[PDB]
Design a protein around this nucleic acid. Sequence first.
DNA 1: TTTTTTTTTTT
Lengths: 63, 283, 194, 144, 176, 438, 171
Amino acid sequence: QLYCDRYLCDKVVPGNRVTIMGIYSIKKFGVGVGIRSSYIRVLGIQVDTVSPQEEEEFRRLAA
Amino acid sequence: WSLHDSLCNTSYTAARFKLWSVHGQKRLQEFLADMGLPLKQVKQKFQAMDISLKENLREMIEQSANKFGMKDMRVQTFSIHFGFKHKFLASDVVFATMSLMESPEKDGSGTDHFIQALDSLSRSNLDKLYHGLELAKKQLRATQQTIASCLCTNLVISQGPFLYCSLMEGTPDVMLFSRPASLSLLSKHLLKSFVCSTKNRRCKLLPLVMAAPLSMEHGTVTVVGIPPETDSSDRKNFFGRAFEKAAESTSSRMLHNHFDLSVIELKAEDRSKFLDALISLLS
Amino acid sequence: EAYFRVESGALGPEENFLSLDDILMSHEKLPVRTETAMPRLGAFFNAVPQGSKLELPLWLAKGLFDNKRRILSVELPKIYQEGWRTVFSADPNVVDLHKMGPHFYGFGSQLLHFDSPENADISQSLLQTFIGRFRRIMDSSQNAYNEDTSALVARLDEMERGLFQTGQKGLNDFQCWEKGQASQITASNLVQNY
Amino acid sequence: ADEGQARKSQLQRRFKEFLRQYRVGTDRTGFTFKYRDELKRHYNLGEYWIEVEMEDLASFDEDLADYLYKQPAEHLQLLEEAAKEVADEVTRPRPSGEEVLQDIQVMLKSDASPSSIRSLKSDMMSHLVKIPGIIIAASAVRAK
Amino acid sequence: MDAAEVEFLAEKELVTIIPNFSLDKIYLIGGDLGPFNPGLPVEVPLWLAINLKQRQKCRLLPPEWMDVEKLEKMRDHERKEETFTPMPSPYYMELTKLLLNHASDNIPKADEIRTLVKDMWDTRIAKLRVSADSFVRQQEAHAKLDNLTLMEINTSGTFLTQALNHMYKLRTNLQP
Amino acid sequence: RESLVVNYEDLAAREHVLAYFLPEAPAELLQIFDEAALEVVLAMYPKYDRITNHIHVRISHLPLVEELRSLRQLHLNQLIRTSGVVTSCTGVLPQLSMVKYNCNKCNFVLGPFCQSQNQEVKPGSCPECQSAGPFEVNMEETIYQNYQRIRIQESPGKVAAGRLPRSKDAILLADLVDSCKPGDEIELTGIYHNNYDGSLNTANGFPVFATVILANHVAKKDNKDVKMITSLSKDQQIGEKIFASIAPSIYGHEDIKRGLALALFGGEPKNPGGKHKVRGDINVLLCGDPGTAKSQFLKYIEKVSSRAIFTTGQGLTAYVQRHPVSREWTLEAGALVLADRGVCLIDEFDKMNDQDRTSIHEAMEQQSISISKAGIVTSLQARCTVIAAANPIGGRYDPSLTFSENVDLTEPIISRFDILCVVRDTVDPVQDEMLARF
Amino acid sequence: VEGIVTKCSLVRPKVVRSVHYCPATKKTIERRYSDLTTLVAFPSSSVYPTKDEENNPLETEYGLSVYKDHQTITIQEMPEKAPAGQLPRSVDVILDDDLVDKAKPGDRVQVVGTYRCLPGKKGGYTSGTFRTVLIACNVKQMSKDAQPSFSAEDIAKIKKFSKTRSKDIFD
DNA sequence: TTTTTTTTTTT
Ligand SMILES: Nc1ncnc2c1ncn2[C@@H]1O[C@H](COP(=O)(O)OP(=O)(O)O)[C@@H](O)[C@H]1O
Ligand SMILES: [Zn+2]
């Protein structure tokens, strides 16, 4: 689970490939006796991957 | 590179450690463990390794290499700094230039790569150097995957006074060594791995002769010849005369095109006609 | 670098004769109401009534106009009406002057040769829209380097794209002098064919 | 306690001299101040974020890029408080409509080999990690 | 204009070199130079000092205003004042580029001179886009630029004048 | 690896007194042995401090293999060796190991208390400002450790003779986590530790405590050189010699033996250079009248193959499930993603449902499933070879019609199979003896 | 904000003032209420004082107090404006004071209201996360869904046409 | 937010 912030929000769409640089950390909202939850606070993100002149190859072909 | 991918590829620790046979690959593991280098830091790029390890790396490596029979581990070279992040050893510039000039994929006449390699020696072109360091890597990882072929298959024939080998097109990454200049280094590393590998006492002191196909249409191969290897070899090769006189005796078709004499292009059919007369000639 | 097209006079008293921008500008349609019959030519819209609403190019309605409104009278499109003249006062940095165009200041300055009543209120819209949209073209054009600017330029018109292409040509020319790059002699127009 | 702020006022000063001094390019061609220019060109556009690169930070001052790998929480704060003191001496005087200095979200990328989710052992708690994956969900933005 | 001609006009400033070759007076169409006594200073125009440095025939010298102390006071004077303050030379950007690129080893503390020059520049450019926004915002008809050098003018002039012409037009389209 | 194995029998041989002290009070002997093995390793490798600075000694095969239903109160806090299938596993959660708080009124960090797995640690009052209050953890100095909980239960046929199968909990700590998956057969070795629960006391009406095995060594019990194979393959006649090695009992059918042998090793999954994605999986579809050892052909291929799974057609994709332990509504794997590289043995192919039919065909020519379920929208991988057997309609295959009639299957599905073997029968005297005798 | 309403809440009163009474002292005390859904935002307690001073008892008077209405609807982004890759976003509106029943599920409204964040705390420890609502102060149905707005010129035309010919108006 | 049993409307 990640946690994006001010300018990292709405930057990626479900279905993307990414490369996260985050601070692996723990929730502090204070199965087992001393178990905590954990997330990755994201502070760096990446994504992996008509024209005027194109119009003429349509024009001449239609003509 | 990372500290791990550069031990597995230097053709001086890839020979001693015998990093082609699972039996001795654990030697590398033990060498790493004797220094306290986590197996997770050694696999990562060297510029990103933790700062607490790299303090005296160049000493804790020279030491723990005495305990393994590698006492010539520090050499004397020079290094250059330009600015904030620019730090080269004088044997990185060499491996990058030497691989910009001999790139496998050819894009024109013979003098199209020469220009691009002459370009990458001035500081105004650090974008070619920094690129010719990804070819020099790709080459070095595709050499230990050939010296691993001719030593887990025993394609080094003891044809008498000299060893002998040959290559197959079907093996991957064998069109890279088609050039008649990037073939001498492959052979000279093959000899260094071999002499360390074999158990005989005769083969350890015989020069090698190698042939690999040049042109499928003309049906011709390229042939080299390298001196008998040792630690203090005088480096005085003698095949420029042998091949000349052998082609003279058999009266076959040969080409001494280059400037050095020990590299020849030979018809695929005159191979044995040439080789037998050469065996007799060297005697 | 040496091909100096004839510029546009569509903002002054009268458009230039040879400027290919004004020629395509005036071609845009405009609504009129005819004052007489139109004999021998009712084929297009033979005669046409008087008091009929028609759509004609701007260049046509240049000579067909007189002070007395002899042949026809004109009424402005809604983009210059009272409706949109408040929208362009709320915040002019939001309007898509390419859909409402793509000649806003060019057209609007030729609708002043029709001596309508509200001219003293059109020549105040334009002035107060162009002044409103200035600090967003002075700063998104001198500060957008090696970026895909095809989205900073999607909501502009021909009088503003000409300035967004002059901010960039002076940014990309100082950044090419700082990097010792504007010393090498290069091919000027042949790299356009290539 | 009293040495805490005295260290910080000496880190927030060495993180500031990095943005203010780091250059690229050689001496033959010509140089380029890499992060002042991006601070200015991103502030004047109204973006408020730079993308610092860890190799640069390492090559300038080697100790800082190690702290940033070990204690990223309490050092990203000093970095983002120096980015705000540099973006002040670069864009000022702000013209008319803005005179309050905004806050600069310092992102950061790197060129290092990625780990994987199966290699997140608990000894990596509060250390910069770098993992690949595939986005599978997305909540709706909220306030904080 | 364009930066590569401001750089041409800036290569007329005088600097002081120390030659290491013998040569007698030269009578240039723009004055006189010499004589060149090996190991003795002489004052020449920049375009010659640079060209002799590249051919390994001289050794440059830092201009007097190029001191790491007076500059650290100009950099503060500029941020205090609220107008364009006077500058060491009318072409300081081009001097501190050409010199520090070609003779950075004959100038001590080059990489602090360079940062102070850039600090001054990055302010004198911020005052311009405020003095070029009040102009439009208030529809002036005149503006006294005090100590602008030709380079600041030329980096944002061909946009400012071209966007003020389109404003004069819009402001005088109702008279007739 | 920071984990050392100590076979118990040799400890008993070379040491008579420790191998008797051990399973009596193992919560401290296994702590002393840690500090012993440490000082040994830090002598054989003086730099190893840079690797985890802590060693755990496991213990291998105590001589007291036991059942999972015969654990009584006599074994509280005693080393124990057991066996049985594992039927759950949470995710690898991090647990506090050496906690360290910080006061909210003084900016001073409290003492490094250790965490015991029965009760939340309790810090006292701040010895610097006496500010007894709700402290919070200090994520930077605290030490964590991996954690995982599993539910082991008795083996199916081993001891569950005429009763229901019991179960137990186990807690795998740092180095052990992810040593076992649901379905594995393991054999724990761990302290049998109890702890007080307040719920059981409110259900049973008596003071009753819960129990859990703090596992100390997990050793799976499952299924895991060429110089012969050289000449054995160079026999030039390995075909006949291998055909009659599969189907070890069932007589006849050297016809279908051939096809199934072809299927087992597979083929070659070449990638076409025109972006057409040809598949390299052989799928088979048996068919024939009842009583001809089809199901046995399925069951033997369950054994001989590797990483195989099995199912009937009377669960095919991942589905939302409320976890037994964690009590969260997670997503669980189906039956076509557990053969992501091996084989999938379908049985009673006819009895599939319409949703099952519309879901099976997608994976044949695409080999990839999407799940936009209540959990979350994902797209996973499924590369399996399908081995199924249908039935003849009317209780007998009759070869007057085409096979596409007696199979009772949708027509574009049969195309997704490579081989179509038809099992048939006939009253034949000379084979009656052959099958009977067998 | 523009978009579709996709639910409504049950209209409920909400106090803004009480009026109490002392049967013993024959006085009359009042009390002004305020919650986080005002423009002033002070959380008052709805204790309904029964003994201001321990001596006298009180008794509420509902007829003289003041209540108001309160609803809560959920605008949701228009379908043909979503980027179609996600589940379109939503927002919570708090209608009030006779704006209440002005929107039914399935409409296309243009609410014009202040935007606000309303915090909370469960047990003296607040998560930073807040919930943001829109305190509407106008509503507009975008689509005109009737044609009664005939012009007087139109009704004139109509009364003309209905009189011109009574023979042939049906045909 | 899960099984299992039982009644009634619906495709
Ligand atoms: N040729 C044979 N050899 C050995 N066993 C056989 C043979 N034919 C039938 N059987 C017996 O029949 C059983 C298989 O029945 P099965 O094929 O599962 O029936 P159905 O197809 O109706 O499920 C096996 O358990 C086996 O004992
Ligand atoms: Zn305290």
